[PDB]
Design a binder for this molecule. Structure first.
Ligand SMILES: [Gd]
Ligand SMILES: [Gd]
Lengths: 147, 149
């Protein structure tokens, strides 16, 4: 069974949040766990704050472009920073719910990539292909509960 | 070189950021490899998608809270709509970074470095997180600069 020959993928961003939560002493659960209302309100506040910052940075970029400015790659840095902050609190929320963000994201990706294989309307709107199946997030969460 | 012995199945799943890049190739929108200033149309598009998903996330959180205020005990299954919208929010957040030609994992890792470092600081008596000795802020400009070269 176990011998000296007995014996690991690089961490994902969702895993980084699990590690952060350990570091801040938050003890977040391994499996999906209904939160107290205080936790939901905290998560909402964090989402609102970062969404607002992203929105403000896009607004600032659009304003400069409206003035006739070409933006540089460096001009993108505040927006990139706030988008990454938004990932952090979005992953943060899933991690505090005990829900494996990568498992859920894979399911959403599956349905989105599948939809991308459909044709487009003449106006450019994406249509679904025949046999398309919606993201089954309820099924994902049920699977995560048993292991 | 690869040979007839090569294992084609890679040892590790693609990252969420890499998935977005694949998604954008699928929709006929193959996006740049390096940070690329966008036209205003693209920024307007990304903003609308962030507003839509963030409004859906908020609605699912409100709905859970309403149920709790009524005295209901939520189950794990009740979390699925919120999980779904949180994942859609990641999708359009990564989506924006990929459309900008900016490697999301590189930016995220720098933000993570600063946040994890802050987590190693002491707590003020009221529970507020303080920074440790030696703390250095996330340097996202340095990250974007590096990605251009
Ligand atoms: Gd921020
Ligand atoms: Gd959505």
């Amino acid at each position: 069974g176990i011998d000296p020959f007995t014996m690991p993928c690089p961490p994902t961003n969702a895993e980084r949040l699990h590690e952060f939560h350990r570091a801040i002493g938050a003890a977040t659960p391994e499996r999906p766990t209904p939160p107290p209302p205080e936790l939901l309100r905290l998560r909402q506040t964090l989402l609102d704050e970062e969404s607002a910052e992203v929105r403000a940075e896009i607004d600032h970029l659009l304003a400069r472009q409206a003035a006739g400015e070409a933006l540089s790659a460096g001009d993108l840095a505040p927006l990139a920073h706030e988008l990454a902050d938004l990932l952090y609190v979005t992953y943060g929320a899933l991690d505090q719910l005990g829900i494996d963000a990568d498992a859920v994201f894979a399911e959403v990706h599956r349905a989105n990539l599948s939809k991308a294989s459909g044709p487009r309307r003449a106006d450019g709107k994406q249509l679904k292909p025949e046999g398309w199946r919606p993201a089954d997030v309820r099924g994902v969460i049920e699977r995560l509960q048993h292991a």
